[PDB]
């Protein structure tokens, strides 16, 4: 997250931290995700496309810090890693950039709700807030495009939804953005999601309800003028989410 503020998990208690164990034992951070039901974390396919093997991954809920434990956290193996069949990531834009991870602890349990672990509501179909609405994004991603390190502490910021009309402009993204994607940015381009934030939540208040409106997907650089963050439009993937969460 470029700019914004530091936060803790009780301000995004659905946020999932996803790691991969390497052949050799070393664990590195992959992407964020969102707990949408006790056994299901939702994220982005591009986080996993090159390493689609479910055994490689570890998921944490209730974690506020990247490389140290948070009291009350829960660690999970990935029982099932479901990627979207129609994903495509030639061109800059990633299409159908959505993934599901069924979570299971060593003891065979899913998520137990607590002060630091709760679920997030999905939007009703094709129901998104109007452009210029302020939404929040969360993640352990870079604080600067040039950084080598990820922050140790979870971060959050606010960005505003951009119309498809505005985002399809040549001086923005042209034809790369589709109607199954949402653009969102800061008016001054001073704050944004960035590398490491992918898969994480774009959360909007939709009828006085917290809603998983988007999933951090792609962008050209971070917090660059005329280059918004691009997010998977969750309200356009509900049938896909419904069927696959029975797997």
């Amino acid at each position: 997250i470029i700019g914004g503020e530091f936060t803790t998990i009780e301000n995004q208690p659905w946020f999932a931290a996803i790691y991969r164990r390497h052949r050799g034992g070393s664990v590195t951070y992959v992407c964020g995700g969102s707990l949408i039901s006790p056994c299901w974390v939702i994220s982005a396919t591009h986080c996993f496309i090159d390493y689609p093997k479910k055994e490689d991954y570890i998921v944490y809920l209730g974690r506020s810090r990247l490389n140290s434990n948070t009291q009350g956290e829960m660690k999970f193996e990935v029982e099932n890693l479901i990627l979207h069949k129609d994903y495509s990531a030639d061109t800059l834009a990633h299409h159908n950039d959505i993934a599901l991870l069924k979570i299971r602890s060593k003891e065979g349990r899913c998520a137990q709700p607590s002060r630091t672990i709760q679920t997030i509501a999905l939007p009703s179909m094709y129901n998104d807030p109007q452009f210029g609405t302020s939404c929040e994004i969360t993640g352990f991603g870079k604080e600067q495009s040039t950084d080598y390190l990820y922050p140790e502490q979870l971060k959050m910021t606010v960005v505003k939804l951009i119309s498809h009309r505005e985002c399809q402009q040549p001086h923005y993204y042209g034809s790369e953005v589709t109607t199954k994607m949402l653009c969102a940015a800061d008016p001054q381009w001073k704050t944004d999601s960035c590398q490491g934030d992918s898969g994480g939540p774009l959360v909007c208040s939709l009828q006085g309800r917290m809603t998983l409106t988007g999933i951090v997907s792609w962008g050209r650089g971070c917090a660059l003028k005329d280059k918004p963050g691009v997010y998977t439009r969750v309200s356009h993937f509900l049938p896909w989410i419904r069927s696959h969460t029975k797997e």
Binding site: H46, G141, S145, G196, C222
Partner: peptide, 15 residues
């Protein structure tokens, strides 16, 4: 910049 520093290219073989 360089695509391997962007959202979209996390956890990728060529990065």
């Amino acid at each position: 910049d360089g695509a391997c520093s962007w959202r979209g290219l996390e956890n990728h073989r060529m990065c």
